Design a protein around this ligand. Structure first.
Ligand SMILES: Cc1ccc(O)cc1
Ligand SMILES: Cc1ccc(O)cc1
Ligand SMILES: [Fe+3]
Ligand SMILES: [Fe+3]
Ligand SMILES: [Fe+3]
Ligand SMILES: [Fe+3]
Lengths: 490, 83, 305, 102, 490, 305, 83, 102
């Protein structure tokens, strides 16, 4: 006979002890552990709500992968690459580049907890977390690898995080801030709670819905399987937060959640926003980006945050306005500066799409449409020189994404600036500036790409010089319009 | 005497790096910014382009140079049309 | 200017390999971007706390190589094949547990064996968790993804051993409820003399933050001592006390241990391409050996009492 | 913020099941194991969002019967891509629930 | 360490012994064993060329099924049923009905060998064969089961072999003749060699090609996985044939091969022929039925038969002519009498298809086209009464399929009749009559469906009475034109 | 006339079930069409040889029930779940083989054990193959697909046991090459007195062609005798001769044997719904018991010599 | 006096069961068969339909009845047009 | 019978590999392990027909290297949907071959 997990589980996490040969602080240094002075004994009340154990883990993960790889194998000849809308292919390129090696970086966030968390259950769940993120990194290199032979842009599934391409810098600045660059408890809060119960559902399930509509089941099946792991190891954050609140650290916990949610938001607005409302073919848009945000972030995530005892973030109303506005402008920026991307942005403003946009975002045509009107005119008159930029956008010193606003009839754009230690910084929002001020030592001597451009680090100091600095190794690799401007014909 | 500024043009969607000159009139500054905006993402229009510090209620004089304005490098300016 | 290039059959960094890239190559190699910029490992302020930590404890390690990334796990394991392998070995161990429990194995051990297990076996969960914690640290600090991956799998194996011990501690308590099984292990780890060499060793090893010293002390000193002085002696004692399950369990654990030793030795061989590294490695081994020997002596004295 | 307020003030809990062989069995199980609760289902093709007010239970016994093959509760993780509510899971069932009422 | 299979394999099949308490003939009765008087000792030279062993078998078959079921699960929402051409859906209906419970019947053919073959290696390989066919029967009930709720015709995946529907009788008459109704050695020759290395490749790989073109990967993946088992257990026949030849039974072996190939041919001409050249959408026809026949039966199978030491069948030239002609007429018969089928036949004679047919079968329009011309005219003038039959076709007393010929400009039709034991039989070919005469006791008192109709066994003696006798339980279940005659619009 | 009906949630024959159809129900139930027409099981001349065979040995069996198809495997196994189960058990046994071979188990058995194995163990491959052949016969003759399916899986299990025996016979010969292991088993099966009760039993059982008598003699008489008088006594002897592998191997085989007994007893219970069947079943048990007892006595005399 | 025959009509693709009458003229037989063929799968045409035993070179007379023909039930006939 | 005669008189042997992860590795293996033989490939999407004249060998060692992961010869059966030629298989390789020359 076998004995049920409930009867021996406590012994697997009965692993805290009282150090005698080194001090408690030497074994769990605050800068790596982030215990906020809460003594070891208090951490033993940590109770991970989504448990697993080693034999179950290897058995079940074996089955998860067998399915993922079998589906990929069975669908190799479905002509997704050849037959898919080029906007969908660019969605794959953007996803794998922006995510694959970041997943592998998440191993290190989990590792930070496995070694340095004072909560025994956290150290064990983070061990399975290490393994999960290894899976995710390896899956999302293996799957795009077959497309290398078809298109050099898929090389960026591996290369992007090794580059200084501007979106890759935005990704690394975020993930290095919330995953690899902070103490174990900050990782628990910012990564597993804020990012992994909050935003990743947008990219791994919201996007899966669109992928299924687009008939790409290899991808939809992959990312939804990945998220089943996420759903388990993300549950490390809640008990950490509850423990902090119980031990008088509510304010500190709230600040970390507030910061991580906003940082995640700005990154997903430039990655997922344009995918859902522009690159994904109209017929395959299960819901709009805003609709998905209201499902996943407002309806599900923010309600969970409340249930655990935290408050709505102070910037709530700013956040809501941003959901209506930000990604439309980020999309415009990525597309106009498409040559700086490793995917081919789809413009997504055929009349039929503009009608959809106007329905999903009343007032769109009087705003962003004013810009797309100019662009469309130039395309129809083959003034292609006016559809390609000859300077650099100004960039946020937090998000590393260009500084934008609302264009057109009720134009409004604001930069939030800050003098600090003899230097002038510019942020794309009140919240981004606030994030900086929460922890200046984390950020203060970081130079964004345009800062580097102005300080002589990019040579020559030209757009072409910048493109080379960003690591593009051939002309083929740089972004172009997804449909070679065939959309103008409509 | 290269002088980098970050400029936001009226009805555009973003702020861009535009490198002007220390001795440029605000009229010349406005032109150099417009180059990267009008007929790209912003429709041309009648009127005089003016230069102001970002979100300010005060406009710089047309003949005033950037050197005379007290502007610092990499500060943000708007380019807008007179009401 | 920009030149034109054709698509490559694999990642740009593998495209000059002579052989066709393996699954292992594709998903494992050169994934630490944090080694690209010496002045700022992480995409933050170059002087951020974690950037200072990595510049000191990884970049400035005395153990040096101009191409750590070229390291290769001799077993070339990936996540997928690790789970195939370990579902095999773990399903086997779980089947041993089931069958030996059906046969009432624990009732037939020699008189007093439950007390030896309570004192010398069940507190192993603390030692194995130290190995788990320490392996995770080498993971997060190692300068190549292929090194870190061996460490991830080793962290998981350490938890595997911990879980074996937890399961068997509980199961044994069902037949022998009056031996302190599952009740007194923390006390023993903290205060029993036979455990104090091991505890001192691990507390000190867990505060060796240089990645090279962490790897050497953990995998070249601590872990081989555990094989020699804990695993194999327990097998001998089990044999003498009619415990026929423990030797089989330990044989499965020893397969993991030998795998750890295999990749460790392959890393040493890679490192020794740099002549300076022999003295560095040897110095760390000499530094930690005394603590390890004292640990083993105290444990063995406790086991044989 | 009317729209946002209404979206936030919900007490919906329950599993998000990814496309596959667990979708229909989980829906049916939610109905059987929560009698007198209305079960809502939103189908997004790649996944289905299944919910009830305040609490939603899935028992291993019912799920096994609806799935039609031997089933261990831990296996649900193969197809549980997300969930609303806090989670309490054991060998006999999984419970999705909220502490608060909004 | 483990020892390699080569070192212990002989002991697994060292299982022949000399009976002492019953006689050799009592233990292996000729009527069940079919040893043709060859003594036990001679059978020990039997050497199965495609070996497996129990541990490898359960491990590998576990993996095969995991893939088959994972793909099915991942593709449930691909809208194959809703979005596929109705001709493709009818292809699924025909396949599962005609095959699923016949696969399960094949367990019994394998079982007959497992118990009664004098060759030890054959008895072991037939044990894995039993298991394979169990897999195949269960797969091909499980997969169509989800469609029951959509269409009552999918019920026939289970019901067909329980019915007296005319195509089901043709299937059962064949499979009961070559699988379940003869001695072990006849099964080895007729089933595993003739049918399973010869014809099943047409339906499980040829058809898979068309399924992949049609974008139905759940089905293509299923049937190609099934055929990987076939490829192993079908290799039981070759060594049996070689053994018979070595022991002076060449003539007997040749006759059994000749008979089984022809019987299989007539059945696959009515099942697979219409699927490949008419039901499958034109754009999805990887090759024509004849092209697939020349690949699989002539190029591969007949060459293998020669290599083993057998001769081309005596009826070779008749066979070749039949490949040009038979299925075109069987298709016409199934479609005109569509109401007697459990699937909805597609006519497949839009001008675009008729051009394809003329290219693949020069002279088609002057032959079958003459008939389709009349039918098409009646459809276009809504004389639907002339597109539905009011009598029964005459049926072959061997194949159980209607008696046909070449229509149109060079009309030619021949019935091959036989008086025997005071009864008049009619066969659709010289070969079918020859098959009967090879073994009259197997066939002589069998009554085909029309024989039963004339002898008063079908009441009332009307087409409707016949439809009821065939087991149709509702109006929905009976065959209709796949496209509700929408093809006429072209 | 023809009426209109809506689609059904499952097969027409299951549509009146109260519960939702299981995987087992869907793929296992009512698949023998050969029972539909009493005068011609098979779609051939009603007087064809195989039609006469089935009319005599299935249809006319004294063991009768108006709904054999309602029989249910108590384990409700399908092909898919059988392979999951047995890959688990067989991977475990193969891991036992590997590990016990690493430890040189066979060298440490008691003096002379190789000779006992050569005489009493290795010729089991003949007995197990008889069980394989006999199980296949019950498969092809049983009057319900759910019965036949239990028989298919039992045929495979018999081959599993045969293969264990073949593997271990060869392996043992590597340590003991002078005992006739892998060389003299046919001779022993044919001429050794201890094997002759078993051989006579199986030769006669294999010529019992009535499906009911075949099932009763095989599963209610022969196979339970093998458990009582062969498997368990071998475990006892192994224990006395320091063979610790054989008892574990046999425990795995006994799991299969108990499964066979479980479905067999469920079939008896189904059959006994018909009162007439008690006397039929009991009569066949009494008929075959003497042969089975003599078989066991002769084997046991040989084993204990 | 129902009399079953299997009939093959000229230019059709199959043989069908057609039940005629013992006292039917070959002219009447030909009509009953044609019913199931002409305007279904065979174009109508000018000429006299004739009845022969399957593949025979001899035609039955138009006025000859099936009873007078010596035909046996379920035998095969062709229905063809005079050359 | 010209067409039929020519189709029959072939000496093509080799694996038919079903759609999946073994198609390209088997093609590459056929080329490497049969140097100086021309390998023909017919792609039918659901399967690929791979052939050489008279004899075609696939070795475990090469197939493992081309597949890029650990591989046992017996595993080929997961994807070997058919084959032309007689078969001789062992732990080291599979050989497709004809006894006769036509
Ligand atoms: C980028 C990323 C990191 C971790 C993770 O789990 C998902 C995505
Ligand atoms: C009908 C059938 C029978 C056996 C088989 O293997 C395939 C198909
Ligand atoms: Fe992840
Ligand atoms: Fe994650
Ligand atoms: Fe089959
Ligand atoms: Fe088969």
């Amino acid at each position: 006979a076998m004995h049920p997990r409930k009867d021996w589980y406590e012994l697997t996490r009965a692993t805290n002890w009282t150090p005698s040969y080194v001090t408690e602080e030497q074994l769990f240094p605050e800068r790596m552990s982030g215990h906020m002075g809460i003594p070891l004994e208090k951490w033993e009340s940590y109770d991970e709500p989504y448990k697993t154990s080693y034999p179950e883990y290897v058995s079940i993960q074996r089955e998860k992968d067998a399915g993922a790889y079998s589906v990929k194998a069975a669908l190799e000849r479905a002509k997704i690459y050849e037959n898919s809308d080029p906007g969908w292919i660019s969605t794959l390129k953007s996803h794998y580049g922006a995510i694959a090696v970041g997943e592998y970086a998440a191993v290190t966030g989990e590792g930070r907890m496995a070694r340095f968390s004072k909560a025994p259950g956290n150290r064990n769940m983070a061990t399975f977390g290490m393994m999960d993120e290894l899976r995710h990194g390896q899956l999302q290199l293996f799957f795009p690898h077959e497309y290398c032979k078809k298109d050099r842009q898929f090389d960026w599934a591996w290369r992007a995080y090794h580059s200084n391409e501007w979106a890759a810098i935005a990704a690394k600045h975020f993930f290095d801030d919330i995953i690899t660059g902070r103490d174990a408890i900050s990782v628990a809060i910012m990564l597993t709670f804020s990012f992994e119960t909050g935003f990743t559902n947008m990219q791994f399930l919201g996007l899966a819905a669109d992928a299924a509509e687009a008939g790409d089941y290899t991808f939809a099946n992959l990312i939804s399987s990945i998220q089943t792991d996420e759903s388990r190891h993300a549950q490390q954050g809640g008990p950490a937060l509850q423990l902090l609140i119980e031990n008088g650290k509510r304010e500190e916990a709230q600040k970390k959640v507030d910061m991580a949610i906003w940082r995640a938001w700005r990154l997903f607005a430039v990655l997922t926003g344009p995918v859902m409302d522009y690159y994904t073919p109209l017929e395959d848009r299960s819901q709009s980006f805003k609709e998905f945000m209201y499902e996943w972030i407002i309806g599900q995530f923010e309600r969970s945050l409340i249930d655990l005892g935290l408050d709505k973030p102070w910037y709530w109303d700013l956040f809501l306005k941003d959901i209506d506005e930000l990604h439309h402008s980020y999309h415009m920026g990525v597309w106009y500066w498409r040559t700086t991307a490793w995917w081919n942005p789809a413009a997504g403003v055929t009349p039929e799409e503009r009608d959809w946009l106007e329905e999903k975002y009343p007032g769109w045509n009087k705003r962003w449409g004013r810009c797309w009107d100019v662009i469309t005119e130039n395309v129809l008159n083959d003034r292609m020189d006016l559809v390609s930029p000859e300077t650099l956008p100004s960039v946020c010193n937090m998000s590393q994404i260009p500084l934008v606003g609302v264009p057109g009839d009720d134009w409004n754009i604001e930069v939030f600036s800050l003098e600090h230690n003899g230097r002038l910084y510019h942020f794309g929002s009140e919240v981004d500036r606030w994030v900086f001020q929460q922890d200046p030592v984390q950020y203060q001597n970081h130079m964004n790409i345009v800062d580097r451009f102005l300080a002589g680090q990019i040579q020559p100091m030209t757009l072409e010089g910048a493109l080379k600095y960003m690591g593009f190794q051939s002309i083929e690799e740089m972004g172009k319009d997804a449909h070679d401007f065939a959309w103008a014909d409509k | 005497s290269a002088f980098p500024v970050h400029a936001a043009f009226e009805k555009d969607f973003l702020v861009q790096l535009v490198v002007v000159d220390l001795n440029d009139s605000m009229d010349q500054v406005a032109e150099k910014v417009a180059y990267h905006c009008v007929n790209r993402r912003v429709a041309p229009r009648e009127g005089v382009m003016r230069v102001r510090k970002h979100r300010s209620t005060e406009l710089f004089p047309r003949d005033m140079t950037i050197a005379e304005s007290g502007l610092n490098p990499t500060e943000v300016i708007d380019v807008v049309f007179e009401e | 200017s920009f030149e034109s290039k054709k698509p490559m059959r694999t990642w740009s960094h593998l495209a000059e390999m002579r052989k066709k890239p393996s699954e292992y190559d594709i998903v494992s190699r050169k994934l630490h971007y944090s080694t690209n910029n010496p002045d700022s490992p992480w995409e933050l302020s170059p002087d951020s706390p974690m950037n200072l930590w990595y510049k000191q404890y990884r970049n400035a390690s005395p153990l040096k190589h101009d191409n750590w990334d070229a390291f290769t796990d001799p077993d070339q394991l990936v996540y997928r094949t690790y789970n195939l392998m370990q579902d095999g070995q773990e399903s086997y161990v779980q089947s041993l547990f089931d069958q030996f429990n059906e046969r009432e194995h624990d009732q037939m051990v020699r008189e007093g064996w439950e007390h030896t297990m309570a004192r010398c076996y069940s507190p192993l969960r603390y030692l194995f968790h130290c190995l788990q914690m320490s392996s995770a640290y080498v993971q997060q600090m190692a300068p190549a993804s292929t090194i870190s991956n061996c460490c991830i799998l080793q962290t998981a194996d350490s938890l595997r051993w911990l879980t074996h011990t937890a399961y068997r501690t509980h199961e044994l308590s069902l037949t022998y409820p009056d031996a302190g099984l599952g009740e007194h292990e923390r006390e023993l780890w903290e205060k029993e003399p036979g455990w104090q060499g091991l505890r001192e060793l691990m507390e000190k090893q867990l505060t060796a933050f240089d990645w090279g010293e962490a790897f050497v002390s953990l995998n070249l000193v601590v872990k081989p001592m555990i094989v020699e002085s804990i695993f194999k002696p327990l097998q001998q004692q089990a044999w003498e006390n009619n415990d026929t399950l423990l030797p089989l369990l330990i044989d499965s654990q020893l397969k993991d241990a030998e795998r750890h030793s295999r990749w460790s030795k392959a890393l040493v061989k890679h490192a020794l391409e740099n002549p300076d590294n022999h003295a560095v490695i040897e110095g760390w081994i000499e530094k930690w050996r005394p603590l390890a020997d004292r640990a083993a002596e105290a444990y063995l004295s406790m086991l044989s009492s | 913020s009317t729209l946002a307020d209404q979206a936030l003030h919900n007490n919906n809990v329950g599993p998000i099941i990814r496309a596959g062989d667990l979708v229909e069995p989980v829906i049916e199980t939610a109905e059987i194991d929560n009698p007198g609760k209305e079960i809502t289902v939103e189908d997004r093709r790649a996944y289905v969002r299944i919910a009830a007010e305040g609490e939603l239970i899935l028992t291993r016994k019912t799920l096994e019967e609806q799935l039609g093959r031997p089933f261990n509760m831990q296996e649900l993780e193969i197809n549980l891509a997300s969930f609303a509510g806090q989670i309490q899971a054991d060998e006999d069932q999984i419970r999705f629930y909220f502490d608060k009422t909004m």
